[PDB]
């Protein structure tokens, strides 16, 4: 059956609106690339790192904008809101960028339209994570995720009562329940012949967390490699 309750349907629409408005789809986007450093892999290309660090700062700003529109998030303590965002930041950035992947040309497209190939992605800052992220993006395609599912999955990672240094974890748990429910029925309302899409989709979070964990370490190695410092917002977020 999989009927969509008005209460659930509204939640699903809030999340999708939140994702679309803070993260344009790959198709609804004019693209552009560059020429520099698209040849061979290198420890780090400054010109690219600069451009990439800017887009990251902006997408983090957007990530917060996305969070604030989520039901109940604003009603959390500031300390908890900040603890959640810092913990899920990479989870969401990776999940997002991985939905900007075009298989044929083997590229990732950022929000300004900038489209980088695997090599440039590596030279921009990803480095050791480049192959993990691209592999993950390839594991996503079979799921045929839309804006709503990509949104719910993001919110589910964000609203996680299983984060350390929280002061009201139980209330974060209650907030996540509807998100998990809305996802279950929505995922199956679209793929009624395959109910296994819900757990499979959910389990991709396990993999996401590991890549994200590697990400936190890459921030440390980059902070060593780069000339200047990390942009203030990056620093506040991952340090």
């Amino acid at each position: 059956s999989y009927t969509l309750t008005p209460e659930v349907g509204e939640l699903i629409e809030k999340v999708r609106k939140a994702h679309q408005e803070t993260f344009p789809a790959l198709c609804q986007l004019g693209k552009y690339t560059t020429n520099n450093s698209s040849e061979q892999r290198v420890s780090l290309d400054i010109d690219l790192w600069d451009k990439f660090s800017e887009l990251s700062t902006k997408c983090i700003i957007k990530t917060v904008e996305f969070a604030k529109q989520l039901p109940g998030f604003t009603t959390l303590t500031i300390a908890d809101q900040i603890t959640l965002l810092k913990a899920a930041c990479l989870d969401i950035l990776i999940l997002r960028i991985c939905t900007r992947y075009t298989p044929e040309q083997d590229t990732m497209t950022f929000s300004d339209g900038l489209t980088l190939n695997r090599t440039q992605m590596h030279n921009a800052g990803f480095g050791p994570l480049t192959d993990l992220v691209f592999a993950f993006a390839n594991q996503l395609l079979p799921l045929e995720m839309d804006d709503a599912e990509t949104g719910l999955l993001s919110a589910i990672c964000l609203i996680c009562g299983d984060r350390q240094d929280l002061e009201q974890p139980d209330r974060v748990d209650m907030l996540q329940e509807p998100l998990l429910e809305a996802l279950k029925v929505y995922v199956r309302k679209r793929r009624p012949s395959r109910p296994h899409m819900f757990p499979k989709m959910l389990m991709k979070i396990t993999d996401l967390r590991s890549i994200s964990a590697k990400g936190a370490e890459r921030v440390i190695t980059l902070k060593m490699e780069i000339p200047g410092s990390m942009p203030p917002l990056i620093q506040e977020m991952l340090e």
């Binding site: 700003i61 917060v64 904008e65 604030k68 500031i78 809101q81 900040i82 965002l85 203030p232 917002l233 506040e236 977020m237």
Partner: peptide, 11 residues
């Protein structure tokens, strides 16, 4: 700290 973060959250 979180100066910037607080700004984004206080809106």
């Amino acid at each position: 700290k979180h100066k910037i973060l607080h700004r984004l959250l206080q809106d």
